[PDB]
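Hi L.,

As promised, Host translation inhibitor nsp1:
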Amino acid sequence: KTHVQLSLPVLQVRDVLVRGFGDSVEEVLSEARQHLKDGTCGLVEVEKGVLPQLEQPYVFIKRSDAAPHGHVMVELVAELEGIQYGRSGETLGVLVPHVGEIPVAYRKVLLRK
């Protein structure tokens, strides 16, 4: 399938134990997709002071369209030193590994895969 329905655990930035997916744009997009597929991917909502507490390169989910079955359609954009790899809509948040942190909420997304 070109798209996959996912429910992403929303984590508080200060709870996150593994604060990024790796060391290159290509690695973080690779690892983010692997974690999304394996159900081991969390989402941190981007507010003032969040991104400086996470590791670059960042992986964003961004709105790709204006929402089947409650799932917002999203795609992955990476960012490293202020340059984005990909072009998409509004940030729904920043993806991080999930290693058992307790979420505050779930974000239903339809991931272009």
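The helical segments are 25-38.

Thanks again for sending the construct details.

K.
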